[model samples]
Target: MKQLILALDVMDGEKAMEIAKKVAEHVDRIKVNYPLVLSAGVGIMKRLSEIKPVIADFKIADVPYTSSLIARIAFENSAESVIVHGFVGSDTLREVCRVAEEFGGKVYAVTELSSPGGEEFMSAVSLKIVEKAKEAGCHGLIAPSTRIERLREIRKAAGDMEILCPIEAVKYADGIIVGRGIYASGNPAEEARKLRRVLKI
Candidate 1:
């Protein structure tokens, strides 16, 4: 089935947990970013894991050793996958993939940012990043949902690797990562239900 991954970027531990549970049945996975981790600590991944598979959206961009260290910590905390920045080069991605293999986790490489700024430079080299991610044995690629052309381009280069993106790119992505649309809604559970229906997850 196509997947729905909730971007639980909320900073408040209590609220994050509440939202996670409410939408737990609808989403295939829950994604946590630095804001949530800095506020709730890495253990939050372990706690959230009880509700659904967790993706550590650290957007890791560091040297090989440091990247591996970060991936290990996230995996140990129960993160099913960790997102890394592909622009950092294949060496760092390789280390991350190695750690993921050890933990039975996954490494998702970010080829393009969803924000407007991403187009400034990332779009130009996004394909190259896709190649690097493939060479490094990354499990997936994080493409942008805003640009269909670029997303399709990346999909072509990515071949069989999993692809994650925001809504509307499901035609090309293996899963959709949603945030404010659900977490910020008046009824997150209902919102998630609607999203699940839309994505047919």
Candidate 2:
């Protein structure tokens, strides 16, 4: 089934939990980034995991050991998967994947960003990033929906690797990662349901 992953980028732990609970039934996973983790603490992952599987969007872009250390902590805090930057190269990606393996977690590599600035450099080498990420044993990819052509390029290169993106790329990706679009709405759960319906089509 196509999945819907909610990105809880909010800074308040209470608000995050409230949104998670309200939309738990409509979403397949909950994603926590630095904004939330830094303010709510890594413990937020454990709390959110109770409602849905958690993805740590650390965008890790460090050395081998450093990335591993971060992945380890994220897994320890109940993250089902962690997102990292593939530009760091396969060596670092491999190390992070190794740590993920120890905890039975998965790793997702960011191929390209949805921002216009991302087009400047990342779009050009996103295919190479896809190749490297796959070779490094990443479980999935973080691709952009803003550019359908780029998303299609990454999708073909990604093969069976899961691709997660905004709802605009729903047809090409395995799941969608929505943040402010849902949480900032008048009714998060209702908005989540609407997104899920869109994914179904």
Off by over 4 Å in 1: none
Worst 10 residues of 2 by lDDT: 183-192
- Give the alpha carbon lDDT tens digit for every residue of 1-201 in model 1: 778888887899888898887878878899999999999999999999999999999999999999899999999999999999998889999999999999999999999898989889898999999999999998998988889988889999999999999645777988888887876777877887777677763
Estimated TM-score for each candidate: 0.94, 0.94
- Clashing residue pairs in all predictions, respectively, total 0, 0
Pairs of colliding residues, candidate 1: none
* Best lDDT among the predictions, by candidate number: 1
What is the overall TM-score of model 2 with all chains considered together?
A: 0.94
Candidate 2 yields a Cα-based lDDT of 0.88
